[PDB]
Amino acid sequence: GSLVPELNEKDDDQVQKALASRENTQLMNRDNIEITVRDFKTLAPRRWLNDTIIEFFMKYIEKSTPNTVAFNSFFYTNLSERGYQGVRRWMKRKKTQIDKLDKIFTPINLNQSHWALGIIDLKKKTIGYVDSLSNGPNAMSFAILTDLQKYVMEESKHTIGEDFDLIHLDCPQQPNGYDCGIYVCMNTLYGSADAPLDFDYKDAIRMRRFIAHLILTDALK
Amino acid sequence: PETHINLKVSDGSSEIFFKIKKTTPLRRLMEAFAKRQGKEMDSLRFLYDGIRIQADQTPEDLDMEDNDIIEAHREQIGG
């Protein structure tokens, strides 16, 4: 069917009211992710998501999926610009260790203009790069895959990662220029559930409202 | 090195050293850093070991240790 639900009328109206609030108030503050109205409005129709919404969705997937870490997008920025040393201390702050995980998700911001996703699957021994506006395996995608493979090898103290398969994963492609962050969230949701990537652009429209509902209903308890 | 802590805030080019009480909110520190870059607070994310600091959280709240670093990152957007 679809892993992105449709909101009832009451829940949808709550989202519409919050998108119209007159001033930049705090809408949610839980699990070290604070969301203001300015952040929330990036979920309005046709708008580019910002890092706050991407981080909130990563937290939601961590909250509902076992043995999973989903970093915010600043993890890949640091790893790519400043090597493993730039993210060496981050897993410790997740209160867990790489050898206890099934998956690590790493949302990637590309040049302040596009969002994509890395999926480290420790159980399947694979590192995947999934992009909703891609023509296919290319060289930038390779630097990302080798960076994630490097992370696994260093964080595990060279116990795991050297034999992982690096793959440019296929996924439903966005039909517009603004849904990339929503496709990142759908790819994290479906990848966390180990579900076939068969969502589409109508799911992307519903996804914006679903994520907005999760925020207003304080889904991270 | 009991009640007070030394912290550095860096954006990768500009770094400012601060010494605050462990029970003092980081708000003032964060606003001072932003003002020096002439940048708005809502455009900057202040992270500690990957955790997005909320102004008002203290060093004690985040388990900081002397000479820890706070990274100031630019908001990210994408289509």
UniProtKB/Swiss-Prot annotation, chain A:
GO biological process terms held by the UniProt record: G2/M transition of mitotic cell cycle; protein desumoylation; proteolysis
Active-site residue numbers: H114, D131, C180
Molecular function, one GO term: cysteine-type peptidase activity
Key word S-adenosyl-L-methionine present: no
Protease: region residues: 32-221
GO cellular component, as recorded: nuclear envelope; nucleolus; nucleus
Keywords: Acetylation, Hydrolase, Phosphoprotein, Protease, Thiol protease, Ubl conjugation pathway
Recorded family membership: Belongs to the peptidase C48 family.
Functional summary from the UniProt entry: Protease that catalyzes two essential functions in the SUMO pathway: processing of full-length SMT3 to its mature form and deconjugation of SMT3 from targeted proteins. Has an essential role in the G2/M phase of the cell cycle.
Additional comment: Present with 377 molecules/cell in log phase SD medium.
Protein name: Ubiquitin-like-specific protease 1
Protein's organism: Saccharomyces cerevisiae (strain ATCC 204508 / S288c)
Gene (name only): ULP1
Part of the whole protein covered: 401 to 621 of 621
From Swiss-Prot, chain B:
Native source species: Saccharomyces cerevisiae (strain ATCC 204508 / S288c)
Signal peptide coordinates: none
Keyword set, alphabetical order: Acetylation, Isopeptide bond, Phosphoprotein, Ubl conjugation pathway
Record family assignment: Belongs to the ubiquitin family. SUMO subfamily.
Protein name per Swiss-Prot or TrEMBL: Ubiquitin-like protein SMT3
Note: Present with 2940 molecules/cell in log phase SD medium.
Function noted in UniProt: Not known; suppressor of MIF2 mutations.
Chain coiled-coil ranges: none
Organism phylogeny: Eukaryota, Fungi, Dikarya, Ascomycota, Saccharomycotina
Residue span, Ubiquitin-like domain: 3-79
GO cellular component terms listed in the entry, alphabetical order: condensed nuclear chromosome; nucleus; septin ring
Superkingdom in the source lineage: Eukaryota
Subunit comment: Activated by a E1 ligase composed of AOS1 and UBA2.
Gene: SMT3
GO biological process: protein sumoylation
Molecular function terms from GO: identical protein binding; protein tag activity; ubiquitin-like protein ligase binding
Cross-link (Glycyl lysine isopeptide (Gly-Lys) (interchain with K-? in acceptor proteins)): G79
